[PDB]
Design a protein around this ligand. Sequence first.
Ligand SMILES: CCCCCCCCCCCCC(=O)O[C@@H](COC(=O)CCC)COP(=O)(O)O[C@H]1[C@H](O)[C@@H](O)[C@@H](O)[C@@H](O)[C@@H]1O
Ligand SMILES: CCCCCCCCCCCCC(=O)O[C@@H](COC(=O)CCC)COP(=O)(O)O[C@H]1[C@H](O)[C@@H](O)[C@@H](O)[C@@H](O)[C@@H]1O
Lengths: 67, 80, 79, 577, 80
Amino acid sequence: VNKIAQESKNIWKLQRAITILDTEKSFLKCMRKAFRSGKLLQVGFTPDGKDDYRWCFRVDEVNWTTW
Amino acid sequence: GKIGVLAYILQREIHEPECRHLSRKFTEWAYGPVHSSLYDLSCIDTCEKNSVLEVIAYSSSETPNRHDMLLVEPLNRLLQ
Amino acid sequence: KSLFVDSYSEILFFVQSLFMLVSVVLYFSQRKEYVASMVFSLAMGWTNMLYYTRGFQQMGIYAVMIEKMILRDLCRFMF
Amino acid sequence: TGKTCLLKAMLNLHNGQNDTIALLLDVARKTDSLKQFVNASYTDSYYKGQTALHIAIERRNMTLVTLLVENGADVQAAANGDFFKKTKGRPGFYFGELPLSLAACTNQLAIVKFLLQNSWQPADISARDSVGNTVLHALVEVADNTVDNTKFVTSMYNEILILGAKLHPTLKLEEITNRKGLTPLALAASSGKIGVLAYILQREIHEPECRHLSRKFTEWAYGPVHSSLYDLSCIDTCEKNSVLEVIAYSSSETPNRHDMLLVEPLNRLLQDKWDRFVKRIFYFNFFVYCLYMIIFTAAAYYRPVEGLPPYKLKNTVGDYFRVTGEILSVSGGVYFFFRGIQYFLQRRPSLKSLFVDSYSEILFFVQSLFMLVSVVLYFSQRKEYVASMVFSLAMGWTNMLYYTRGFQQMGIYAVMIEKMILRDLCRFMFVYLVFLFGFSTAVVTLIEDGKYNSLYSTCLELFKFTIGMGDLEFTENYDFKAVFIILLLAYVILTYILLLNMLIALMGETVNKIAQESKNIWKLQRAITILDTEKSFLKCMRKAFRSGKLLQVGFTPDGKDDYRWCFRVDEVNWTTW
Amino acid sequence: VYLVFLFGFSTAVVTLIEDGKYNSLYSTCLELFKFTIGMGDLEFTENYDFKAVFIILLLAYVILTYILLLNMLIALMGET
Ligand SMILES: CCCCCCCCCCCCC(=O)O[C@@H](COC(=O)CCC)COP(=O)(O)O[C@H]1[C@H](O)[C@@H](O)[C@@H](O)[C@@H](O)[C@@H]1O
Ligand SMILES: CCCCCCCCCCCCC(=O)O[C@@H](COC(=O)CCC)COP(=O)(O)O[C@H]1[C@H](O)[C@@H](O)[C@@H](O)[C@@H](O)[C@@H]1O
């Protein structure tokens, strides 16, 4: 038990990930809300004049250094 | 199971002209110490065949770091 | 080999169902031994309840620890 | 949104420069007027109140700050839009809404000093935002107990105090309260900002005309030895938010509520209070409770065995003693009942703090409830009162462990018992009960027309394995003996060999990790005991107020002298002669 | 701690019992002690009413002393 704590957390997270993927693959209801994060424009400037919408996922962060 | 390369790619941010579009991590706003980043998630959440989540989850049990790869930041937050 | 070194829960649920089906066959085969099958399935069914401890962080991690104890320490000790 | 061209230009700076800003300001001057232009601000509910000065500060552009202030910008413009509120469910950044608090919250000391000591419009250092929080309150808010954050927050807090004293010697910044009545010290204590609290409580300022601001003073220092003094104002006692009261009666969600009492003056003060005042009272309370439980045990043990209570009192000594003990036991039950109600009413727990914390008061209340139910059944002519009474009796004896606090060795042991029950026994009992019920159902299904053949008897019979009494051949009323024995062996292996030994391993793992947490929790438990004792006190005793009214500096900002009830701590150092 | 638990539940059980073979603080104290050494009968008497109360008391005692406290003692001695 002293040695498998982190391994146990990792395996649990993997087991939950498998459950999630099976649920989203089955879904029994033609639900599209399983597709998360929203179709946002990251740059809006591809190598050509077009804009790129890339389904990005938002993460807030706070840092008190490197002002 | 090349966790290092995966960790690099998923949060790659390129600060120069004509190579911004190559990034997969973008910073939208940053007021003070607070800033809101955006991860790409193309071919992570869903795609034609090889979604990264599908590839890791349905790995063959011999991949070296199949347990650790999900600790990479955007994947952990996305699964939660 | 991947069939047995990994995906234990699929095996256990499948074996539960196998015992159930053998129970049905014996039941309609006019053998009392269907009871012998049924109880085994019943026992396994309740132990397979632990499959659902995932989704609960404390209990899921605990269940993984139980799994690993069975595979490593209980196996060596029992031999 | 309502943003003007100036605000658009300010949000687009190239290496901190944008020449069109001075162009727009000069044009505004020459057109009609500037004061409305330079104070233009957003109107939408998200960025409401944001103005160019805020943008200058957050961009860390000194030049624009100086220019905008010079041109008559409002240094008291409050940005109270939704992005500038706490609002845990939305993104944003709280900083106190004011340019001075914004400068302080972003580690920009030069801008703070300029805003305070500019020629055109100096900032009001005592100003308060919509929440009532002034700069010091905001600085407490932005703390998160991390090293790099805490360093600058403590430093800026120090510097703002120095500047406030120099500019307004008669102003007492730390005495300002927000809408909640909290001073920055009380706010730091309530919110668990242990770093800032540790800074404040032992603050020492070595310079003339700022000595009075310190809270740690050195009276004499002969050689390596020197005797320091801690202020203890608003720690030991005050109007509302005593620091000890704030920490002890925290809502259990405060991050560092266990750690905050490790701060030196608090720990020494609590120990002094204990030894001087509370130790004797607590021991006496323990003695009284022991007498109560002995009397209750004696009353219950000698209950009559005839049917149909209540029972006629026999004119004999033993029955007089029995009914006397019964009356006293019911009295004590009522006492703990009303104490539980009083605790609930005074603390008003929000139905989660009622269960996730304060287990002792719940247990004593439950004991008293069982006593009252016992009385009701007793006079209701039901023998079932016995069923109630015994539970109360059992709980009463186990509640004796409540008094293991106040003993350093035993209280830690009691805390570890609590943690074992809450973590490891709960997880084990869930899994064990799943296995037990599953195999019980299997075995009782196999058994037919036997003595057992029933869920209760088979469950108990399998449970006997856990206590080392499993028969392993308790019945033959089945067919397929091989199936029966296989089930029992599998149950034994899975539960007895694996799970109990795994429980031992996990308890060993847990004990290795909760040593310091146990010391902190025990210290907190004893602190709560001390505060309750000094709060009730039943005699109007003034010895509870410790440390003695000493003169610290004797030189306030005016010629008055300061008597601050300081607490003396003697210390030695064999370095830095 | 163990003696507090033992005495508390002994007094509870001997209170519940009436006019039995045990019906005495010593006999019940010894009988509950037998659980600690792995010899607890768990049905040592029926001289009561309220069987559910009796069995609930014994199970609570067993859980608190045998399962919790003894394993806790082992863990603490390991730390020591
Ligand atoms: C007569 C009665 C006999 C019953 C005997 C059985 C008792 C336990 C029953 C409890 C049920 C728990 C369960 O359902 O199975 C547990 C483990 O079961 C065992 O330990 C079998 C011991 C044989 C988790 O199974 P899982 O599918 O998650 O396997 C994990 C992969 O998924 C994951 O990707 C990783 O590769 C990870 O390394 C894998 O483990
Ligand atoms: C039929 C018979 C059954 C008896 C069942 C019960 C047996 C145990 C009886 C032992 C009595 C010990 C006791 O009297 O209670 C112990 C806790 O024991 C339990 O775990 C009860 C589980 C229910 C201390 O409770 P405490 O009030 O100190 O809670 C702490 C706060 O005070 C502190 O400020 C912190 O917030 C900390 O996080 C809190 O924990």
